[PDB]
Structures are given as structure tokens and as C-alpha cells.
Design a protein around this ligand. Structure first.
Ligand SMILES: CCCCCCCC/C=C\CCCCCCCC(=O)OC[C@H](O)CO
Ligand SMILES: CCCCCCCC/C=C\CCCCCCCC(=O)OC[C@H](O)CO
Ligand SMILES: CCCCCCCC/C=C\CCCCCCCC(=O)OC[C@H](O)CO
Ligand SMILES: CCCCCCCC/C=C\CCCCCCCC(=O)OC[C@H](O)CO
Ligand SMILES: CCCCCCCC/C=C\CCCCCCCC(=O)OC[C@H](O)CO
Ligand SMILES: CCCCCCCC/C=C\CCCCCCCC(=O)OC[C@H](O)CO
Ligand SMILES: CCCCCCCC/C=C\CCCCCCCC(=O)OC[C@H](O)CO
Ligand SMILES: CCCCCCCC/C=C\CCCCCCCC(=O)OC[C@H](O)CO
Ligand SMILES: CCCCCCCC/C=C\CCCCCCCC(=O)OC[C@H](O)CO
Ligand SMILES: CCCCCCCC/C=C\CCCCCCCC(=O)OC[C@H](O)CO
Ligand SMILES: CCCCCCCC/C=C\CCCCCCCC(=O)OC[C@H](O)CO
Ligand SMILES: CCCCCCCC/C=C\CCCCCCCC(=O)OC[C@H](O)CO
Ligand SMILES: CCCCCCCC/C=C\CCCCCCCC(=O)OC[C@H](O)CO
Ligand SMILES: CCCCCCCC/C=C\CCCCCCCC(=O)OC[C@H](O)CO
Ligand SMILES: CCCCCCCC/C=C\CCCCCCCC(=O)OC[C@H](O)CO
Ligand SMILES: CCCCCCCC/C=C\CCCCCCCC(=O)OC[C@H](O)CO
Ligand SMILES: CCCCCCCC/C=C\CCCCCCCC(=O)OC[C@H](O)CO
Ligand SMILES: CCCCCCCC/C=C\CCCCCCCC(=O)OC[C@H](O)CO
Ligand SMILES: CCCCCCCC/C=C\CCCCCCCC(=O)OC[C@H](O)CO
Ligand SMILES: [Cl-]
Ligand SMILES: [Mn+2]
Ligand SMILES: [Mn+2]
Length: 393
């Protein structure tokens, strides 16, 4: 399958559902340009991260640990852990919410059931992961194809669709959801993990052999990112055609998101959406847990036991549940926090991929490094404009 698949399941976590449905319901098609821009940003960034592991032989947390001063390494590890908890917050609550959509249990008992499954998910082997990892990939992909079909059948207003690709914002609320979309697509925890997925996969330590893996990875990433982008744009366009302007109660909330596929799936739309949300949440929550321990091992050299890390990341989920906070609102919030961790992940990535002592003959072309720094400035400005609107005028 490759690393572009383990990536792709992270681009369809409950965080993507929350930002797509809410974005289409609240702002129509006006944010389609964000999904396209963020998806093209991820293509460049994930290619740089993948080329870092192939060329250097180490992941990004390892290179920071071995090259940068100890206090800066500590800071970069702390912020990476905050990114890891925010990542798991959306994925754990997304699965717990899907439990409520399927069984009607309260969110607390949905999290208890989610907690037992995730702890049983760590005690897994390749012969046991294969039927479960293939099944969740089937459920999520089929729902994705359902939105590609539904966007055609829903007859979206093409004039509004076309205008939505023109970069425009509509107050602070549109910036909040746009930053959430960027964080949901350009995920910092995948930035650190993608370099670890490609670091050891080499049959002959040769520049010729390394270039092939770079070329083969570039095709697999762009093909995977193109498909994920079409699905995300379809899901936002279908939610826009379904809720935007209709003045429906709790429009954009994940409790009613199944109504986007009701004209296609009929009565099965509720179960098929909740099953997909559950398979998307359980699989991503295990992927992020495996990524967080790899991130800490790379930064600190050591790691806490896997059961303790799984226990710590559950606490913000139960706190949010006990606080009565709306799950769909905190899934979007977590994606916004993730987008604030993107610039930190990009600075070492852009510096390391431009060095010959790190990359060897595979130094990034000067143009793609410039494009990477432009993406870093755009995201810093977007995060700055958002923090500006949230604190003052
Ligand atoms: C889970 C969200 C998926 C969204 C993107 C799916 C495309 C990449 C994933 C699998 C195909 C890779 C293996 C098939 C090609 C060989
Ligand atoms: C505020 C702290 C975060 C700074 C973000 C970038 C950190 C170091 C710059 C990279 C240069 C190499 C450092 C040695
Ligand atoms: C949050 C920022 C933490 C910075 C880490 C730091 O400066 O402390 C030094 C380190 O813990 C050991 O030398
Ligand atoms: C799939 C099997 C799991 C649970 C079956 C239903 C168990 C829950 C039945 C009582 C809750 C209910 O009335 O329907 C379920 C859900 O709440 C409707 O949205
Ligand atoms: C602490 C959770 C247990 C609360 C007290 C036990 C009651 C129970 O059986 O579980 C909760 C149930 O949902 C109530 O209707
Ligand atoms: C991953 C890409 C999968 C294919 C992409 C979408 C193509 C739609 C294919 C069949 C549905 C035909 C529509 C009629 C459904 C009834
Ligand atoms: C902004 C939104 C981005 C959209 C992203 C591209 C989505 C289209 C890709 C595949 C759909 C292929 C399956 C759609 C075919 C449906 C069959 C159909 O249209 O049937 C007509 C019906 O009979 C009444 O005339
Ligand atoms: C069935 C439709 C669902 C599947 C397709 C959805 C997206 C299709 C095209 C993307 C951009 C739309 C381009 C349409 C142009 C809008 C328009 O008609 O206005 C002219 C425009 O202002 C001056 O070019
Ligand atoms: C692939 C390239 C373009 C996809 C189709 C481009 C947009 C097609 C939508 C045209 C459409 O909306 O057809 C419905 C009806 O005929 C009037 O709206
Ligand atoms: C995710 C990577 C693969 C994604 C592949 C999906 C391709 C869709 C891309 C662009 C569609 C834009 C079509 C251009 C239509 C714009 C119409 C327009 O600009 O309208 C002008 C008017 O002035 C407005 O106010
Ligand atoms: C310093 C000016 C602040 C706003 C600059 C961007 C405004 C959007 C204009 C073009 C976006 C095309 C991509
Ligand atoms: C500059 C990059 C432009 C990228 C835009 C084209 C990407 C491919 C589009 C859809 C993939 C369809 C699914 C591929 C099968 C897996
Ligand atoms: C160094 C800077 C990076 C770290 C600091 C910036 C990271 C997040 C910034 C703004 C998001 C704050 C959004 C505030 C929205 C209101 C929160 C709230 O009221 O509770 C949550 C709500 O219930 C459900 O979203
Ligand atoms: C909004 C702006 C977003 C920008 C959208 C641009 C579209 C680029 C899409 C895919 C390129 C992915 C490949 C990136 C090239 C990395 C390979 C490289 O530069 O160096 C190769 C070297 O052999 C190994 O390090
Ligand atoms: C040739 C200058 C334009 C760049 C092409 C951008 C579209 C294709 C993306 C990456 C190609 C591989 C780049 C390897 C360096
Ligand atoms: C926004 C995306 C690109 C902005 C412009 C970046 C396009 C490429 C400009 C960088 C460049 O010219 O590459 C350096 C050149 O190889 C020697 O100076
Ligand atoms: C502020 C706008 C950003 C301006 C573009 C940032 C410059 C990118 C850069 O200087 O890096 C490329 C070079 O290859 C590194 O050695
Ligand atoms: C932020 C925009 C400018 C930051 C982009 C400039 C950083 C690129 C760079 O490091 O340029 C190499 C030069 O040798 C420096 O030491
Ligand atoms: C931690 C997230 C990294 C980004 C940090 C955000 C705050 C710093 C931005 C300052 C200039 C941006 C101000 C807005 C630019 C003009 C609009
Ligand atoms: Cl409209
Ligand atoms: Mn995601
Ligand atoms: Mn809700």
C-alpha cells in the first residue's frame, strides 16, 4: 500500500468531516478554495517530509534531536506533544460520537467503549491489523465515493461553486473555519510521521535507488492527495447544497450530517455515515498514537509506555465530555490548534531538505524550497489574522 495510504486515512479523520460539513452548511461553497489550497500545500509539504526520510535516513524529530541545541529540542518536543493530544482529541471523540450515532449511548459511555477498543487496538499484530485496517479503509473510501456521486446528483449551483474557488473571506468566522480546514489537511503529526515511514525503506544505499523512491513516492502522494481533495471538496459542496440557506436546526453538526447522503443512500444514510465516522475515528486514533510515540522517541531518545500515552491522551476527551461541550465544535477547534503547529513543523523541514550534508545529491530544488517558505508565511499570516480577530479588532 505504502505511506501515502497511512497518510490518506489521516486526511479522512473525524476532523475532516467536522470542518467539511460545517464549512458547507455555514458558508456554502465560499471555502472550496481553502480545501484546494490546503490540499496543494500538503502535496508539497508531504513530499518534502517523505524525501527527508528517504535521503537522510532519519525522521524529522531525530534530525532535530541530533543537530539542534538541547533547550530548542525540548521546546520542539513539548509543542509536538500538544499537537499529538489535539490530533487524538478529534479522533477519539469522533469515534465516541459515532458510538452515540449507532447505539444512542451517552458520550461518556461512548468514550468508555472507545477507550476499551483503542486499548485493545494497541495489542495487535500484522495478521490482526490487516483485516481491520483494510475494513476501515473500505468503509471510509466507499463513503468518499458516495460524496463524489452525491455532488453530481445534488445539482449544485455552478455559479456559486465557481465563485467559491476565488479566495474570499467573510468575517472572523470564515477565517476560523478556513484555518481549521488547513489544519485538518496539513497535519503536523503527519509531517513528523511521514519522514519516519520512508526512512528505512531502501534496498541499496545508492543515489540512483534513492531517486526512484522519491519519484515513486511523489506519484503515490499526489494521486492520494488528489483523491482525498476531490472527496473533501465534494463533502463540503454536498453539505452546502443540503443545509446552506435552508435554516435547519443544528446544520453542520455531525449529528445531522447523514442527511447529506439521504437522497442517495435513503434510510441507510444514518448507519452508513456513523459506521464510516467510527471506522475513520478508531483507525486514526491508533495511527496518531503510533505516531506520537515515534515522535517522542525521535525527540527525546526515550519514550513512556504505550499504555500510559494512550491513557494521557484520553483525558482531554473525557474532560470535554464531562464539560457538556459539543463534540462537533471541539473537533473543529482541535483542527484549528493543529494549524498553529504547522509553521513549527515546517521550519526544520524546509531547512533540512535544503542542506547537502542532510540530503546529499537529493537537495530540494531551490524553487520548491521557495514555494515551501511561501506556504509557511501564508499559514503564519492566517494564524496571525485569526488570533487578531479572536483577541481584538
Ligand atoms: C482513507 C482515505 C483515502 C483517500 C485517498 C485514497 C487514495 C490513497 C489510498 C489508498 C489507495 C492506495 C492503494 C491503491 C493504489 C495502488
Ligand atoms: C521560538 C523557538 C522556535 C523557533 C523555530 C525555529 C527554530 C530554530 C530555527 C532553525 C535554525 C537552526 C537552529 C539551530
Ligand atoms: C515551553 C518551552 C520549553 C523550553 C524548554 C527549556 O527551555 O528548558 C530546557 C530543557 O528543559 C532542558 O535544558
Ligand atoms: C448495530 C448494533 C448496535 C446497536 C443496535 C441498536 C442499539 C441501540 C438501540 C436503542 C437506541 C435507538 O433507539 O436507536 C439507535 C440509535 O440511537 C438510532 O439513532
Ligand atoms: C460513573 C458512571 C456510573 C453512574 C452511576 C451508575 C449508574 C449506571 O448504571 O451507569 C450510568 C447509567 O447510564 C445511568 O443511567
Ligand atoms: C476512488 C474513485 C472511485 C470512483 C470515483 C467516482 C466514480 C463513480 C463510480 C461509480 C458510481 C456511478 C454513479 C452512479 C451511482 C448509483
Ligand atoms: C466542488 C465539488 C467537486 C466535485 C469533485 C468531482 C466529483 C465527480 C467525480 C466523480 C463522480 C462520478 C459519479 C457521478 C455520476 C452520477 C450519475 C449521474 O449523474 O446520473 C444522472 C442522473 O440520471 C440525472 O440526470
Ligand atoms: C453537477 C455539478 C457537480 C460536479 C461539478 C462540481 C464542480 C464543477 C466545476 C468546478 C468549478 C465550476 C465552474 C463553473 C463555472 C461557474 C459559472 O457557470 O459561471 C461562470 C464563471 O463565473 C466564469 O467562468
Ligand atoms: C471533468 C470535467 C468537468 C466535469 C463537469 C463540469 C461541470 C458539469 C456540471 C454541468 C451541470 O450542472 O449539468 C446539469 C444540467 O445540465 C445543468 O446544470
Ligand atoms: C485536490 C487536488 C485535485 C483537485 C482537482 C479538482 C479541480 C478543481 C480545481 C479548480 C476548479 C475551479 C474552476 C474555475 C471556475 C471558477 C469560476 C470563476 O472564477 O468565477 C468567476 C467569477 O468572477 C466569480 O466571482
Ligand atoms: C498585504 C495584503 C493582504 C491581503 C493579501 C491577499 C488578499 C487576497 C488577494 C489575492 C489572493 C490570491 C491568492
Ligand atoms: C500539481 C498537482 C496536481 C494534482 C491534481 C491531479 C491529482 C490526481 C487527481 C485525482 C486522483 C484520482 C485518484 C487516483 C487513484 C488513487
Ligand atoms: C503560539 C500560538 C499557538 C498556540 C495558541 C493558538 C492556538 C489556538 C488559537 C486560537 C484558537 C482559539 C479558539 C477559541 C474558540 C472559543 C473556545 C471555546 O469557547 O471553547 C471551545 C468551544 O466550546 C468549542 O470550540
Ligand atoms: C498554494 C501553493 C501550493 C503549491 C502547489 C504546487 C504544486 C506542487 C504539487 C505537487 C509537487 C510535489 C513534489 C514536490 C517536489 C519535491 C521534490 C524536490 O523538489 O526535490 C527532489 C529531490 O530529488 C528530492 O529531495
Ligand atoms: C520543472 C519546474 C516546474 C516544477 C513542476 C511542478 C509540477 C510537478 C511537480 C513536481 C515535479 C517533480 C519536481 C522534482 C524537482
Ligand atoms: C506561491 C507559489 C510560488 C511563489 C513563487 C515561487 C515560484 C518559483 C520562484 C522561486 C525561484 O525562482 O527558484 C529559485 C531559482 O531556482 C534560483 O533563484
Ligand atoms: C515573506 C515572503 C517569503 C519570501 C520567500 C522566502 C524566501 C525563501 C528562501 O529564501 O529559501 C530559498 C533558498 O533556496 C534558501 O537557501
Ligand atoms: C519568513 C520569510 C523569509 C524566510 C525565508 C528565508 C530562509 C531561507 C534560508 O535559510 O536561506 C538560506 C540563507 O543561506 C540563510 O542562511
Ligand atoms: C504559532 C502559529 C504560527 C503563526 C503565528 C501567528 C502569530 C504571529 C503572526 C504575526 C504576523 C501575522 C499577522 C497577520 C498578517 C496580516 C493579516
Ligand atoms: Cl449562494
Ligand atoms: Mn485530517
Ligand atoms: Mn453536536
Amino acid at each position: 500500500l505504502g505511506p501515502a495510504v497511512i497518510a490518506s486515512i489521516a486526511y479522512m479523520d473525524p476532523g475532516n468531516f467536522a470542518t467539511n460539513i460545517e464549512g458547507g452548511a455555514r458558508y456554502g461553497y465560499s471555502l472550496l478554495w481553502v480545501i484546494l489550497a490546503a490540499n496543494l500545500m500538503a502535496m508539497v509539504i508531504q513530499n518534502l517530509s517523505a524525501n527527508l526520510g528517504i535521503a537522510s535516513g532519519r525522521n524529522l524529530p531525530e534530525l532535530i534531536r541530533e543537530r539542534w541545541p538541547r533547550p530548542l529540542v525540548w521546546f520542539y518536543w513539548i509543542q509536538a506533544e500538544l499537537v499529538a493530544m489535539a490530533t487524538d482529541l478529534a479522533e477519539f471523540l469522533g469515534a465516541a460520537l459515532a458510538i452515540q450515532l449507532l447505539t444512542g449511548l451517552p458520550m461518556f459511555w461512548g468514550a468508555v467503549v472507545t477507550g476499551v477498543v483503542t486499548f485493545w487496538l494497541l495489542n495487535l499484530q500484522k495478521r490482526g491489523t490487516r483485516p481491520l485496517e483494510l475494513a476501515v479503509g473500505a468503509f471510509v473510501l466507499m463513503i468518499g465515493v458516495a460524496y463524489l456521486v452525491q455532488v453530481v446528483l445534488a445539482r449544485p449551483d455552478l455559479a456559486a461553486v465557481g465563485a467559491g474557488f476565488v479566495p474570499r473571506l467573510q468575517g472572523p468566522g470564515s477565517a476560523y473555519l478556513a484555518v481549521g480546514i488547513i489544519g485538518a489537511t496539513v497535519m503536523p503529526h503527519v509531517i513528523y510521521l511521514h519522514s519516519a515511514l520512508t526512512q528505512g525503506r531502501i534496498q541499496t544505499d545508492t543515489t540512483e535507488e534513492k531517486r526512484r523512491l522519491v519519484r515513486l513516492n511523489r506519484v503515490d502522494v499526489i494521486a492520494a492527495m488528489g483523491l482525498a481533495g476531490l472527496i473533501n471538496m465534494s463533502m463540503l459542496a454536498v453539505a452546502a447544497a443540503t443545509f446552506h440557506g435552508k435554516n435547519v436546526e443544528n446544520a453542520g453538526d455531525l449529528t445531522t450530517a447523514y442527511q447529506t447522503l439521504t437522497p442517495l443512500l435513503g434510510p441507510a444514510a444514518s448507519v452508513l455515515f456513523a459506521v464510516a465516522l467510527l471506522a475513520s475515528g478508531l483507525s486514526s486514533s491508533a495511527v496518531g498514537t503510533m505516531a506520537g510515540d515515534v515522535i517522542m522517541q525521535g525527540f527525546m531518545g526515550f519514550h513512556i509506555p504505550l499504555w500510559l500515552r494512550r491513557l494521557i491522551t484520553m483525558l482531554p476527551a473525557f474532560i470535554v465530555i464531562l464539560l457538556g461541550m459539543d463534540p462537533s465544535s471541539v473537533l473543529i477547534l482541535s483542527q484549528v490548534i493543529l494549524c498553529f503547529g504547522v509553521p513549527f513543523a515546517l521550519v526544520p523541514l524546509l531547512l533540512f531538505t535544503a542542506r547537502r550534508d542532510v540530503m546529499g545529491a537529493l537537495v530540494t530544488r531551490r524553487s520548491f524550497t521557495v514555494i515551501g517558505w511561501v506556504i509557511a508565511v501564508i499559514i503564519i499570516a492566517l494564524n496571525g489574522y485569526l488570533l487578531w480577530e479572536l483577541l481584538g479588532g
